[PDB]
């Protein structure tokens, strides 16, 4: 199930992040109530700090495609998101030594920056 | 009237000990600070309880050396607030001494200097003791000298640098550190006495008859020669009675302010004439910096005799050397040798390998042959900087790589400045 995104074993979390990344490509622009990674943004704030470098990077690219699937209406709730998300993104995504873990974290911040009215 | 001494890095600190050991014997001052007996209060202050305290600051970015000061023979002599220590040393890196570690302690050090300057009424300036190759000695000093040129800008500052020598060298990068401090300390120093540790090594092997000298051996010899230069300030002689006169007599060019010091006689503890010792001042074997003054022009020359000396013997020995040797001078100089005498005998340390001599002399002469010493450093520097070797250490501790080149150009320009004077 989806609740396996917080499962103990890493390779089962790694699935859920890929499963999610599909969801945000393949699900509805209008958006299923199953797309509730807005009104609890603590979820992905947790996922970005995964405690596994490979399953972390996969959570960030799921957050990334989520965070561009949200350029559809109405998502005025991007204020809450920047508060919850970019501190984890900066603290441990930009920080990362991993080439791709960093590159997608910056891209994520970009997408949160243009969610906002200004910088 | 007062002069403040500063000691930076192990070199400064440990030579400091040797000098203040020797100052207290010359002034009959006790290890506890007392005195059963003015001109000497240029260097010492006085407690209400009849105790004589040095006007000195000890600085090291690491306890070990200064810890031995304040648990040793002269632990009582210094106030504990004068002895300042950090925890992480500079690790033979000018960058850490100047930028990374030095900024963490510079303000405490400048503050403790203000406390000694506040006790003083007519402060003259600063004497500064430090190594070249050391990270603390190079980096922190050059920083401290910059900041003293602000907080005390309108007064003198004198250097006592320890020129590096492979025989006691602790680091590969000592040429780097030497060049880097000499660049940034050039504008902020009025006069600077270099001490080649190789010459001091050579002298101790030949004239003191020691196989493998220790630092104590070298520091004692050095402290004897430092005492000879500061004797004029501590006993009220006729020559070099205050810090300005050092620049007046020895510095006819702000940049070229690096005198060669020559000291005779160095007699093992196992008497000579006035003429014999004055000839030894023009013998390279007894110089503090290894070069050949015969290959260079003299800009000035002072003779500081001390002991059983007849002023007429001096004038004979001078005329002997002025006639029977060819000491080339520059045409725009007073062709006359300045002299001063202090009739007190050269004090040695009880136990010292150096013997008590009846008379002694220390010749301070701003010859252009000392450029040879800068050339040796500059060359070693060039070899390593050609491959950017060890440069990442410096750049990774807050230093721009450009500063290497800016320093090297300032050393190349100084080598040209020595050349144009001597042609």
């Amino acid at each position: 199930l989806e609740q396996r995104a917080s499962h103990k074993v890493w390779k089962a979390r790694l699935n859920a992040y890929q499963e999610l990344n599909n969801l945000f490509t393949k699900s509805s622009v209008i958006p299923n109530d199953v797309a509730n990674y807005w009104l609890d943004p603590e979820l992905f704030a947790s996922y970005i700090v995964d405690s596994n470098v490979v399953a972390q990077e996969n959570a960030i690219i799921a957050l990334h495609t989520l965070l561009e699937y949200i350029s559809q209406v109405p998502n005025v709730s991007t204020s809450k998101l920047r508060l919850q998300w970019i501190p984890p993104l900066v603290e441990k995504g930009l920080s990362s030594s991993r080439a791709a873990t960093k590159a997608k974290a910056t891209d994520c911040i970009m997408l949160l920056t243009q969610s906002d009215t200004s910088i | 009237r007062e002069c403040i001494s500063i000691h930076v890095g192990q070199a400064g600190v440990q030579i400091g000990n040797a000098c203040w050991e020797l100052y207290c014997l010359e002034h009959g001052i006790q290890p506890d600070g007392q005195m059963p007996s003015d001109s000497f209060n240029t260097f010492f202050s006085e407690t209400g309880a009849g105790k004589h305290v040095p006007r000195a600051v000890f600085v090291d970015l690491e306890p070990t050396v200064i810890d031995e000061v304040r648990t040793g023979t002269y632990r009582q002599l210094f106030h504990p607030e004068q002895l300042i220590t950090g925890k992480e040393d500079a690790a033979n890196n000018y960058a850490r001494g100047h930028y990374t570690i030095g900024k963490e302690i510079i303000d405490l050090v400048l503050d403790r200097i203000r406390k000694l300057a506040d006790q003083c009424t007519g402060l003259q300036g600063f004497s500064v003791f430090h190594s070249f190759g050391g990270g603390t000695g190079s980096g922190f000093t050059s920083l401290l000298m910059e900041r003293l040129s602000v907080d005390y800008g309108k007064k003198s500052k004198l250097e006592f640098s320890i020129y590096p020598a492979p025989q006691v060298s602790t680091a590969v990068v000592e040429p780097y550190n030497s060049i880097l401090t000499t660049h940034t300390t050039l504008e902020h120093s009025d006069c600077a006495f270099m001490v080649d540790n190789e010459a001091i090594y050579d002298i101790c092997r030949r004239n003191l008859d020691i196989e493998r000298p220790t630092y104590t051996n070298l520091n004692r010899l050095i402290g004897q020669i430092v005492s000879s230069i500061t004797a004029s300030l501590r006993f009220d002689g006729a020559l070099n009675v205050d810090l300005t006169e050092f620049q007046t007599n020895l510095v006819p060019y702000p940049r070229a302010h690096f005198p060669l010091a020559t000291y005779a006689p160095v007699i093992s503890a196992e008497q000579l004439s006035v003429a014999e010792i004055t000839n030894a001042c023009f013998e390279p074997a007894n110089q503090m910096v290894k070069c050949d003054p015969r290959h260079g022009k003299y800009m000035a020359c002072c003779l500081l005799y001390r002991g059983d000396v007849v002023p007429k013997d001096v004038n004979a020995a001078i005329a002997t050397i002025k006639t029977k040797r060819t000491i080339q001078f520059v045409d725009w100089c007073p062709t006359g040798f300045k002299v001063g005498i202090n009739y007190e005998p050269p004090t040695v340390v009880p136990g010292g390998d150096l013997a008590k001599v009846q008379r002694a002399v220390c010749m301070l002469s701003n010859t252009t042959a000392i450029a040879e010493a800068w050339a040796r450093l500059d060359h070693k520097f060039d070899l390593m900087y050609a491959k950017r070797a060890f440069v990442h250490w410096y750049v990774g501790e807050g230093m721009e790589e450009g500063e290497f080149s800016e320093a090297r150009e300032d050393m190349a320009a100084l080598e040209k400045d020595y050349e144009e004077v001597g042609v």
Partner: protein
């Protein structure tokens, strides 16, 4: 710059690690109960460096290793909290040590590292012992290093990494593991002593005439080398005193910090050494490639920097002469563009069982020979793609192998560049 935190990881890590603690406990006069029964101040002058009881953390995924240490001679002295051990083993899988199983445990280790660092007057840096062909010592060690590097960036990282050789284990995945680990060490450690099992076997077999060397036999050579290179750190002395100063005078280019250690005289396990060597004899165990702990010929490259440590009562005059001699009589082998690149230091306290000894730490470009051997074995294995499903299954990407392969080859090229460099 006072205290050093020590770490040992994996089987080899705790083996040569404990052996090291055995050696320097004796040298400093500490018994297995942790009490001073020495007779000299030069022994407790800098005991605060490695001791408080050792400042040592013991790590392994293999839980058995726990007991192999405590059931050893000085096994009682180590702090019980500083044992941090997993349930299963890594099984020669670097990915399991670096990404999966070793990563799960690494937090527990950092908690103890923090604890020991917390109560240090002034930390110098760290010291890790480990093997590179393993899964735990290499994979979790390198992951531990990076994790410390980022938590303690103001400190030195110093490793005693031992290189795998077919002469000591026929496991063919070791080239993978060691290549991946070298890709880490070149980026993550300030200085690394390259202990080559190839050279340890060749010394026990050919010089010591032991037909079947055991680990204990190879570990004897290692523990004696370690006490030798750490002599400056553990006793009072002017030169190469602390970890940073050492690295400052040893490492001219950040990536080229792989030292070829070697020492003399080479003794067997508890054999009798009636005839004590002379100073010129010791000095002539430097270029003597049969004394190098790494399987490289110093004749085939050039020394960038050299540190010599002479232990025992002897003529400081003669040592200076012999070192000044051997340098200029082989002037073409020491790089010219680093003047006074060789540095010598003497310690009056000799090692156990010897009247005189001499250890020879060298940044020699010949070390490229060592990295050549590892890479060729790696490439032979990697071109047929053998055993890759082990690593990839644990979350690794095939790309990583290519990057580590290329990065080690850049490291070899760099050594070759400075070997062919000229001062002109």
């Amino acid at each position: 710059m006072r205290e050093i935190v020590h770490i040992q990881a994996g089987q080899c890590g705790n083996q040569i690690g404990a052996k090291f603690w055995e050696v320097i406990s004796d040298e400093h006069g500490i018994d297995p109960t942790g009490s001073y029964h020495g007779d000299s101040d030069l022994q407790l002058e800098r005991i605060n460096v490695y001791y408080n009881v050792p400042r040592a953390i013991l790590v392994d995924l293999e839980p058995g290793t726990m007991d192999s240490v405590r059931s050893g001679p000085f096994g009682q002295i180590f702090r019980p909290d500083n044992f941090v051990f997993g349930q299963s083993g890594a099984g020669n899988n670097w990915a399991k040590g670096h990404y999966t199983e070793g990563a799960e445990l690494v937090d527990s280790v950092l908690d103890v590292v923090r604890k020991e660092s917390e109560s240090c007057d002034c930390l110098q840096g760290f010291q890790l012992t480990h093997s590179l062909g393993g899964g735990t010592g290499s994979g979790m060690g390198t992951l531990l290093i990076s994790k410390i590097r980022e938590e303690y960036p103001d400190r030195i990282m110093n490793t005693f990494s031992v290189v795998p050789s077919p002469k000591v284990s026929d496991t063919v995945v070791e080239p993978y593991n060691a290549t991946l680990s070298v890709h880490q060490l070149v980026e993550n450690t300030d200085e690394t002593y390259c202990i080559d099992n190839e050279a340890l076997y060749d010394i026990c077999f050919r010089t010591l005439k032991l037909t079947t060397p055991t680990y204990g036999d190879l570990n004897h050579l290692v523990s004696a080398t370690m006490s030798g290179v750490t002599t400056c750190l553990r006793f009072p002395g002017q030169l190469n005193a602390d970890l940073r100063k050492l690295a400052v005078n040893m490492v001219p280019f950040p990536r080229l910090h792989f030292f070829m250690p070697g020492f003399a005289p080479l003794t067997s396990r508890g054999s009798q050494q009636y005839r004590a060597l002379t100073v010129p004899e010791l000095t002539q165990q430097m270029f003597d490639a049969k004394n190098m702990m790494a399987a490289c010929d110093p004749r085939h490259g050039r020394y960038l920097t050299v540190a010599a440590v002479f232990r025992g009562r002897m003529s400081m005059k003669e040592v200076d002469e012999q070192m000044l001699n051997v340098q200029n009589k082989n002037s073409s082998y020491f790089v010219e563009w680093i003047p006074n690149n060789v540095k010598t230091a003497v310690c009056d306290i000799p090692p156990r069982g010897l009247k005189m000894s001499a250890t020879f730490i060298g940044n020699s470009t010949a070390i490229q020979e060592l990295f050549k051997r590892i890479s060729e074995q790696f490439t032979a294995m990697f071109r047929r793609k053998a055993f890759l499903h082990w690593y990839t299954g644990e979350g690794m990407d095939e790309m990583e192998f290519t990057e580590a392969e290329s990065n080690m080859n850049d490291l070899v090229s760099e050594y070759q560049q400075y070997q062919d460099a000229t001062a002109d």
